């Protein structure tokens, strides 16, 4: 089927970065995969194929012109309703093309996200990681003598005086990164991509709802109609003027695909809503440990104002990207320090796991 | 067929870690693959296809008339049972969709396992594995200068009297490891994932039994039924009012798929029960060698209280991954000492195979 | 279908260079993919296939006779129009062939570009980047003490008039690149390839429009036609001389294909127009920082005369490749300095991020 | 076809070890592949498909009537044999399903082998090879002073006695192995796995013979039968009471499948018998070179007791792996010493063959 | 198609050794692929498919009566020849099965070759290539000072007398390898594999000719045959006793398959005959250059006795491997010396092209 190749054409599956959320991956996955799956179910071997429309021809007729008549109406689905209001049945014919259209409209926002923000993002995260890769062997290297000063000095002279002068000495400061982050907060050109990506999906879901409301739900329990043939050069013939008892064959598939289309998108709407609201608030679930590391305190320090900035997005992506191989280390081990007190344990643990 | 794609789309097959037990692999593969293979066998080349419904119309009707007659009942399958009680045979129509739904529902728990437990569990293992493997560095060298003191000594003095102070020093102390293991002993945030994984499977099996009992097994030996067409625009016609002897064609497939479905799950229940019960007890099959190594003994030390703790799942997965490439060593070889005596043999075995 | 193999035969996807602009990528993608997708949609399982023609044979005719009569007209599509002017319907038979021909004609410019300009342009670009990377090699490395002694002496007469002296110093000049740029600047053997590539595409689009105008849009609302059979050995037979009410089945597919072939190409025209026009002006968006670098100033200084020079396409390809792996660094970071002043910050940032 | 995907799912094809003997491997291929291949032959394009059953209904019955008549007996195959004993020919319906059952039964033992023996057995092999690697480099390290004394020695001290004294000193000793070898010889936990692996195949081929004997071989020359349709709601009708001359179309493929199934397994049985008997005796085809080698002598020294020991399968799996990359050496080159004896000869070759 | 997949299981395409001659590869390819391709052509879409056999039933018969008549004779191919001698026509039905049998029978010999001689041949070739790699640098480090004394001495002491002694000193010899070659050249265990591999193919070609002669060439031009149905339960019926004018549809496929099968083998046989004859003589077409090199002279020295030896086959595979990457060197450059004379040139050339 056509949906087979299209699956790996759209939803097919640097070198050390994850530039997408798992939630975003799942929502795009389901949004692109649902229409193709329903369409594949609609016209495959699972349901018996054959003639989509059948009509009860008179017994006088032979097979050939009966095939003509019931084939001349499949392309002319238009009900002569006497309940002489003339009604159309085109959605039953146009359903698969509509499904493919929705499938492409689902994939379009992914293309915009890929083209509009990937390179600029890729530069920044890689630069930050390359800078922060070795913040560990700067602390322990120079802050190792704190214990070695402890036994030969007093409480405040070590914890509040010897851990006081080392801070203002060029071994920890990163003024280049400070300048960089200060510049970044002015930028607003990347949050636009994310908000547009979510808003387009919301608009497409609304369009799907209005399409399923205005046109569908009207022919939902109708299985029979009366069509006509004598509307041309066949009007001067001796046969039935209005064909009788024409019944569609694939109503159940229509019902199930409509119901699945409603259900999947209605259950996915909250996921996209939550995706949008994640960026509406500053996040500080673990700042307590971040304010102590020599360079990690910078991101916590610039935690002010409206959360709508590129800093929020880059830190959100980074927090998922702190677990590759080198930040996938001590930074993950700092779970036991969870309850002056940092006098000995906070330094014994740091100097214990050197590498 | 859609089953072919769905096979590798569902059950498709770090870098040194096995986060999946073999029994879990077997149960997940069997449970996900059974409905797919059954539904594929139902509608493939093995059984000749055609019209799943057959009817015996009188010879008066034309071929198209018979086609309309028997094609109008496959989608409207409803028996006029006189034994005028109305009965439906809709499971015969809904079998493949039900099998597909069962296949998806079986894959639901796997996503929860991969999304809620993989990162934390993977992060937890390798650090413990490294702290665990750094053993013969500071254990065979603790003994090389210690075994040489035996001959110039007495029975208790060298290996029964100074051993306790030979193990109480800044060589065996691992406060980081003790604190980490105790902290995860108190925690319970991962065992819930395993419990939910097993409980969802049990609930889904129970729902499968309910569905197979309530709806199925009622129309199981019934293969003929009477239907009617004159329930609409064509009721004003001269023909039979109630159709006679419409017979199901694929009853054998129906019964075989039902029997296979019930049999596979009644076979599968015991192994998942065993998987649930595995975690309820402490593993103490091989602690005799663990309580001797400098780092191994700590694992055996904290075995207290109820067996419902995370430490259990970490140690259980550690047992599976205890033999990768470097731990894939003496661990496997410390199996000859299965029967004071440890004076020479226990130490010559160590000092023989350095590397 | 046939297009399945051709899809990866034509549209299928050094080691560090991008020799293709993303806009050109999407243009080629859509341009070659539209005809294949349309023809795949036209003759696949999405719409019921069979006999594309139906005719109303008299009831006396045999089924073999009717099959012979109707199958004798699809290879002889010639309507006996009385509105005895003879109109033929060859496009309804030849549309797949036309679509495939347009697919090859779309592909021709791609191979033209791949076999006319790739080697020379690739070699030139990789050379240029190779010597251009020496900019950072000199950059600040020789200035390590030149900056370390300036603050010990006075401010504006050790590091404010020695900029020329440092440039005059025999490491900053790049005599090789000057002659190369001049020789390229007079050359015009590369811009002709791009101009012809755009012109050939636009001429082909105009040809598509002419084809869709002259032959199509005439038999566009016509669905019924009359044919004749007695034009040979069948003249001396007793039957109808002119066959009556022959209706083509796939009119909707005809209309859909025509409208799509119009719409996608009308959308495609503006983007190729803009791609053609991108070379009418010089690019001066980030040369402000460039005219400080020791080697990048050579590129900036040679912005003279008519913009139709090979250096235009050279710099166009260069700007995309300026973010590969090594230039994908500080050069991308120098965006903070966007408002004497360059005394410290413009130089503190340089001396901060060495490597 | 279904057999296509199952082929690569079932019989499809560390990093330096061959865990499976060639005989067992080829037996596995033939045993799992014969049913799939013959079943694919049964229902593919090689032989014409269609309606497997044919009946000669009299001309009075219509198209649909005869279709119902000959379609109602394929699922209800029961010959009213007058030679009134009803004989059922259900194997003609249960053939492919029984073949698939046999296919699964064939693949059960291999998963038993791979899940019950591979984990435990994989461990000690690398230990064995690691300590077996030492012997070569130790011999060059040890035996180069030994021959250095030979030229100034008389003869017995390098050829007869002192050499035997010279070897038994702590450079030529492998004490840790000696403890492992005897205890592993005492174990029997692995021979049972091999015995079960072969016994399952023997039992299943015996079951196959019983199935082909009891049920088949009776309906083998029979191709025509008389059935009945008046056994229900069709009893009150005016037509023939018992079907006349219903003939099977696929008797030839039935006979070919039976003959191939019996013949392939009849040829296969002696191979598995020989694979069984391979473990009943010890292999001493090359112990003459082994008994002089540093570590290979120990394997030959422990030649006692019954041939049902784990060391037997251990040495069997090593001999398949003595030719990987390092033992793929002089060991293999020692084929020329096949006929005071090794004056320099042996030593001359070893010292000459550094690596 | 069935033979589609069998192609890639059968004829699908160390790490530096070629264990097959290209002539053997191509003859194996054609021998296994010709029946498969002929089968594919014989039962594919290239011809219109359908019923292989047709009969001219009387017009009184119904459609099912004719279908039963011609479907009851395709599996009962037996001509009631009156030119009442009974003649069969089974080959027209058994052709594909015989073809698949041929495909397997010509496929056994490659398996016999790949399991019988590949390991030992690979061992010998890899040992030889690993050992004989020194000779290049070994010679130059010894023959670098012969030009020192060429000008400072005369003919006897640089060119004809002391060179032999300079050659025969303990930097030249390699006893490990000429001691190796004796048992191999006396061995005859590998020529048997090659001779049986060729003889089997000769036997199978002869058997194919016998099958094509005894059975074919008789049913070659006759196109019509008469069959009968009244030979059982249908004898007591009123219809034709002997069927009239039953015509077979696919005579052309039969003829073309037979002609192609005979022609491909009558052109294939000379290749295998020449391959067999290749080993019947010693090969000496470059030994003028080998007889001078240090280690290559040993191979050219042991050219005695009958050419039926393991040395013949080992050198036959060696010569195909003398151009991999390191013997793909000067050894290939010694072509310019193709015409005392070697006084100066034959050392200048060797000493110049070092690396």
PDB file of C-alpha atoms in Angstrom, chain A residues 4 11 22-23 26 29 33 37 40-41 44-48 54-59 61-63 66-67 70 223-226 244-253 256 325 328 332-333 335-337 345-346 349 352-353 355, chain B residues 1-3 5 9-10 14-15 39 43 50-52 60-69 71-76 93 96-97 100 111 115 119 122-124 126-127 134 176 179-181 183-184 229 231-234 237 239:
ATOM      1  CA  UNK A   4       3.827   1.613   3.776  1.00  0.00           C
ATOM      2  CA  UNK A  11       8.105   9.230  10.669  1.00  0.00           C
ATOM      3  CA  UNK A  22      10.356  12.414  24.558  1.00  0.00           C
ATOM      4  CA  UNK A  23       6.895  13.968  24.937  1.00  0.00           C
ATOM      5  CA  UNK A  26       5.558  10.762  21.184  1.00  0.00           C
ATOM      6  CA  UNK A  29       4.717  10.113  16.370  1.00  0.00           C
ATOM      7  CA  UNK A  33       0.909   7.670  12.571  1.00  0.00           C
ATOM      8  CA  UNK A  37      -2.791   3.526  10.239  1.00  0.00           C
ATOM      9  CA  UNK A  40      -4.214   1.326   5.852  1.00  0.00           C
ATOM     10  CA  UNK A  41      -6.859  -0.482   7.908  1.00  0.00           C
ATOM     11  CA  UNK A  44      -6.340  -3.622   3.130  1.00  0.00           C
ATOM     12  CA  UNK A  45      -6.965  -7.368   3.364  1.00  0.00           C
ATOM     13  CA  UNK A  46      -8.355  -7.066   6.911  1.00  0.00           C
ATOM     14  CA  UNK A  47     -11.768  -6.089   5.515  1.00  0.00           C
ATOM     15  CA  UNK A  48     -12.978  -7.788   2.343  1.00  0.00           C
ATOM     16  CA  UNK A  54     -23.997  -2.002  -5.013  1.00  0.00           C
ATOM     17  CA  UNK A  55     -27.525  -1.511  -6.333  1.00  0.00           C
ATOM     18  CA  UNK A  56     -30.505  -3.802  -6.922  1.00  0.00           C
ATOM     19  CA  UNK A  57     -30.907  -3.941 -10.683  1.00  0.00           C
ATOM     20  CA  UNK A  58     -34.056  -5.348 -12.325  1.00  0.00           C
ATOM     21  CA  UNK A  59     -33.968  -9.042 -13.174  1.00  0.00           C
ATOM     22  CA  UNK A  61     -30.976  -6.694 -16.951  1.00  0.00           C
ATOM     23  CA  UNK A  62     -27.861  -8.593 -17.959  1.00  0.00           C
ATOM     24  CA  UNK A  63     -24.618  -8.317 -16.002  1.00  0.00           C
ATOM     25  CA  UNK A  66     -25.810  -3.551 -14.514  1.00  0.00           C
ATOM     26  CA  UNK A  67     -22.067  -3.084 -13.976  1.00  0.00           C
ATOM     27  CA  UNK A  70     -23.704   0.671 -10.516  1.00  0.00           C
ATOM     28  CA  UNK A 223     -27.183   3.129   4.351  1.00  0.00           C
ATOM     29  CA  UNK A 224     -29.537   3.446   1.348  1.00  0.00           C
ATOM     30  CA  UNK A 225     -30.155   6.026  -1.367  1.00  0.00           C
ATOM     31  CA  UNK A 226     -31.878   6.417  -4.731  1.00  0.00           C
ATOM     32  CA  UNK A 244     -33.870   1.912  -6.433  1.00  0.00           C
ATOM     33  CA  UNK A 245     -32.275   0.642  -3.210  1.00  0.00           C
ATOM     34  CA  UNK A 246     -28.604   1.519  -3.598  1.00  0.00           C
ATOM     35  CA  UNK A 247     -26.693   0.510  -0.466  1.00  0.00           C
ATOM     36  CA  UNK A 248     -23.119   1.346   0.532  1.00  0.00           C
ATOM     37  CA  UNK A 249     -20.985  -1.572   1.699  1.00  0.00           C
ATOM     38  CA  UNK A 250     -18.300   0.000   3.930  1.00  0.00           C
ATOM     39  CA  UNK A 251     -20.347   1.983   6.470  1.00  0.00           C
ATOM     40  CA  UNK A 252     -18.767   0.252   9.476  1.00  0.00           C
ATOM     41  CA  UNK A 253     -15.244   1.207   8.389  1.00  0.00           C
ATOM     42  CA  UNK A 256     -14.818   3.263  13.128  1.00  0.00           C
ATOM     43  CA  UNK A 325      28.870  10.503  29.807  1.00  0.00           C
ATOM     44  CA  UNK A 328      26.323  11.537  33.567  1.00  0.00           C
ATOM     45  CA  UNK A 332      23.916  12.433  39.126  1.00  0.00           C
ATOM     46  CA  UNK A 333      25.562  11.079  42.309  1.00  0.00           C
ATOM     47  CA  UNK A 335      21.292  12.490  45.561  1.00  0.00           C
ATOM     48  CA  UNK A 336      22.420  11.402  49.046  1.00  0.00           C
ATOM     49  CA  UNK A 337      22.847  15.061  50.093  1.00  0.00           C
ATOM     50  CA  UNK A 345      30.444  15.335  54.010  1.00  0.00           C
ATOM     51  CA  UNK A 346      30.035  17.783  51.110  1.00  0.00           C
ATOM     52  CA  UNK A 349      32.128  12.916  48.911  1.00  0.00           C
ATOM     53  CA  UNK A 352      36.324  10.604  47.178  1.00  0.00           C
ATOM     54  CA  UNK A 353      35.054  10.005  43.643  1.00  0.00           C
ATOM     55  CA  UNK A 355      37.379   9.810  38.477  1.00  0.00           C
TER      56      UNK A 355
ATOM     57  CA  UNK B   1      -0.120  -7.594   5.236  1.00  0.00           C
ATOM     58  CA  UNK B   2      -0.233  -5.107   8.106  1.00  0.00           C
ATOM     59  CA  UNK B   3       0.891  -7.860  10.495  1.00  0.00           C
ATOM     60  CA  UNK B   5       4.995  -4.385   9.347  1.00  0.00           C
ATOM     61  CA  UNK B   9       7.218  -2.131  14.392  1.00  0.00           C
ATOM     62  CA  UNK B  10       6.279  -3.479  17.855  1.00  0.00           C
ATOM     63  CA  UNK B  14      24.376   1.702  27.721  1.00  0.00           C
ATOM     64  CA  UNK B  15      26.227  -0.370  25.102  1.00  0.00           C
ATOM     65  CA  UNK B  39      -4.602 -12.614  13.167  1.00  0.00           C
ATOM     66  CA  UNK B  43      -6.508 -14.050   6.864  1.00  0.00           C
ATOM     67  CA  UNK B  50     -13.331 -15.347  -0.610  1.00  0.00           C
ATOM     68  CA  UNK B  51     -16.720 -14.360   0.784  1.00  0.00           C
ATOM     69  CA  UNK B  52     -16.770 -15.136   4.532  1.00  0.00           C
ATOM     70  CA  UNK B  60     -35.051 -17.382  -9.623  1.00  0.00           C
ATOM     71  CA  UNK B  61     -32.666 -14.603  -8.558  1.00  0.00           C
ATOM     72  CA  UNK B  62     -29.895 -13.302 -10.804  1.00  0.00           C
ATOM     73  CA  UNK B  63     -26.195 -13.375  -9.940  1.00  0.00           C
ATOM     74  CA  UNK B  64     -26.069  -9.669  -9.022  1.00  0.00           C
ATOM     75  CA  UNK B  65     -29.252 -10.149  -6.996  1.00  0.00           C
ATOM     76  CA  UNK B  66     -27.622 -12.939  -4.974  1.00  0.00           C
ATOM     77  CA  UNK B  67     -24.484 -10.810  -4.583  1.00  0.00           C
ATOM     78  CA  UNK B  68     -26.543  -7.935  -3.180  1.00  0.00           C
ATOM     79  CA  UNK B  69     -28.457 -10.348  -0.935  1.00  0.00           C
ATOM     80  CA  UNK B  71     -23.367  -8.750   0.696  1.00  0.00           C
ATOM     81  CA  UNK B  72     -26.128  -6.892   2.579  1.00  0.00           C
ATOM     82  CA  UNK B  73     -25.946  -9.365   5.489  1.00  0.00           C
ATOM     83  CA  UNK B  74     -22.184  -9.561   6.074  1.00  0.00           C
ATOM     84  CA  UNK B  75     -22.234  -5.956   7.320  1.00  0.00           C
ATOM     85  CA  UNK B  76     -25.675  -6.514   8.927  1.00  0.00           C
ATOM     86  CA  UNK B  93     -16.995  -9.562  12.246  1.00  0.00           C
ATOM     87  CA  UNK B  96      -9.367  -9.017  13.770  1.00  0.00           C
ATOM     88  CA  UNK B  97      -9.944  -5.598  15.344  1.00  0.00           C
ATOM     89  CA  UNK B 100      -5.231  -5.810  17.101  1.00  0.00           C
ATOM     90  CA  UNK B 111       6.402   1.773  27.081  1.00  0.00           C
ATOM     91  CA  UNK B 115       9.959   5.504  30.006  1.00  0.00           C
ATOM     92  CA  UNK B 119      17.089   6.243  32.888  1.00  0.00           C
ATOM     93  CA  UNK B 122      20.749   2.655  34.084  1.00  0.00           C
ATOM     94  CA  UNK B 123      22.296   5.615  35.921  1.00  0.00           C
ATOM     95  CA  UNK B 124      22.164   3.689  39.206  1.00  0.00           C
ATOM     96  CA  UNK B 126      27.172   1.602  36.266  1.00  0.00           C
ATOM     97  CA  UNK B 127      28.443   3.710  39.185  1.00  0.00           C
ATOM     98  CA  UNK B 134      37.592  -1.668  41.923  1.00  0.00           C
ATOM     99  CA  UNK B 176      30.014   7.057  49.777  1.00  0.00           C
ATOM    100  CA  UNK B 179      25.387   6.195  52.201  1.00  0.00           C
ATOM    101  CA  UNK B 180      24.257   5.669  48.597  1.00  0.00           C
ATOM    102  CA  UNK B 181      23.054   2.113  49.213  1.00  0.00           C
ATOM    103  CA  UNK B 183      19.594   6.056  50.801  1.00  0.00           C
ATOM    104  CA  UNK B 184      18.287   3.861  47.993  1.00  0.00           C
ATOM    105  CA  UNK B 229     -33.644  -7.952   3.878  1.00  0.00           C
ATOM    106  CA  UNK B 231     -36.567  -3.883   6.411  1.00  0.00           C
ATOM    107  CA  UNK B 232     -36.593  -0.723   4.312  1.00  0.00           C
ATOM    108  CA  UNK B 233     -37.186   0.661   0.823  1.00  0.00           C
ATOM    109  CA  UNK B 234     -37.312  -2.817  -0.758  1.00  0.00           C
ATOM    110  CA  UNK B 237     -41.231  -6.220  -3.422  1.00  0.00           C
ATOM    111  CA  UNK B 239     -39.611 -12.144  -3.090  1.00  0.00           C
TER     112      UNK B 239
END
